[PDB]
Amino acid sequence: TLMQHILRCDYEACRQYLMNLEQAVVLEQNLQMLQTFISHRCDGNRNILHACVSVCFPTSNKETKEEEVVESKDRKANAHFILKLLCDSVVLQPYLRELLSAKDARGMTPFMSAVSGRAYPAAITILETAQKIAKAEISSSEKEEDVFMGMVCPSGTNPDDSPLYVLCCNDTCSFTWTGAEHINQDIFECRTCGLLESLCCCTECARV
């Protein structure tokens, strides 16, 4: 139910559910309900925070130009509000550590996914949240800077997947400014995708 509210971007329903879960914690009742919700997953081994991040992904440049069933405007706004609400809610504070250090089917944390999907607002929200968490658990046997790096770019991660590097690599396709016009640019073939020698992609596409 609550995972669906997240995916449906029903901010009000999410907030009401979190209020009831907070009461559940305070009253020491329905604690299994909270643990069950935390353990919920969708496809890609994505947890609730991963689901929020995926929802926050953009679909068109027209929407960003304007900025400069749920409607796209409300879709993005509510997805961001739900992500931030979950990050701020007292219900999940003890569990946000685990949810943010958890890796999806591609090895990415919610933050790394927000970067990969160009959900920079979501990535910023998550990064702020992550620093809060690592600074809450300084009382543990771990160094503040183990927990933080986990949430952002965990140990054993392929450096080429590093959020900073990826953020620099995430440029747009040349078509967005060249159109179908022919320019002098580096071009690559990719047999994996059927882009044989007659076809080609620009460097940016080859990288991403």
């Binding site: 669906q4 995916l7 449906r8 069933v69």
Partner: protein, 255 residues
């Protein structure tokens, strides 16, 4: 609680077409939030262990031991939910009070195995399952032939054309839909513990219209129909052997 959704995919087809059908289900869950149809709403709070689809009826096995079936049809109006169910759901006429452990389905009949290991037959056209008045534990008329009247079935698998069972004593038995019952003498075999299977327990069965595979503790073993390419290799070898090289006298038998 769970919800029951129906998916149909024209055959032959593709993987991504199928993925799009599933995508449509996801979209409905997150866009419409529609109420589930009455006929199967009783199963929302029930726990389903196994489910099978017959040529005209679906059937469900619950962890509580109950079994039920319901008629269905695929609507051409949405092939161009794609499935519509009748309002009459039929619960297993459990006059014995005996729970079921597994189910399967054949083209002419539904199949089920009780916790006692008894084999049940229930044709889709019948309102009640078969029962032998002279043998209260015989709920399948051909169990005597298979020897399953004295063996506790512990696992079953069956799809349209073929049906296969494992007994607690590891004996395999295999029978076919009544439409092949007249040529089943080359399709079927009684309950036997094949030496190829001895030494390991059967964990589960994977039957299909054409053949069966038994998944055992440390190995896989299969029996049933050969795909077409090997059938051709076999026939070609036979013909070649017959053509390759006559003292014909009175009384000689010839073809």
């Amino acid at each position: 609680m769970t919800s029951i959704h129906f998916v149909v995919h024209p055959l032959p087809g593709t993987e991504d077409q199928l993925n799009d059908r599933l995508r449509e289900v996801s979209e409905k869950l997150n866009k419409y939030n529609l109420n589930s149809h009455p006929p199967l709403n009783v199963l929302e709070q029930a726990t389903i262990k196994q489910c099978v689809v017959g040529p005209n009826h679906a059937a469900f096995l619950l962890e509580d031991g109950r079994v039920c079936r319901i008629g269905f049809s695929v609507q051409p109006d949405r092939l161009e939910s794609p499935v519509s169910l009748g309002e009459d759901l039929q619960w297993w006429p459990d006059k014995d009070g005996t729970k079921f452990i597994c189910i399967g389905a054949l083209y002419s009949e539904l199949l089920a195995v009780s916790s006692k290991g008894e084999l049940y037959q229930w044709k889709w056209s019948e309102s009640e399952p078969y029962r032998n008045a002279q043998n209260p534990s015989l709920h399948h008329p051909r169990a005597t032939f298979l020897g399953l009247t004295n063996e506790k079935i512990v696992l079953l698998s069956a799809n349209s054309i073929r049906a296969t069972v494992a007994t607690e004593n590891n004996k395999v038995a295999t029978w076919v839909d009544e439409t092949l019952s007249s040529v089943a003498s080359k399709l079927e075999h009684t309950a036997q513990t094949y030496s190829e299977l001895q030494g390991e327990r059967i964990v589960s069965l994977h039957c299909c219209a054409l053949y069966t595979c038994a998944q055992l503790e440390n190995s896989l073993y299969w029996w049933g129909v050969v795909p077409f390419s090997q059938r051709k290799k076999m026939l070609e070898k036979a013909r070649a052997k017959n053509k390759k090289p006559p003292n014909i006298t009175v009384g000689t038998q010839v073809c």
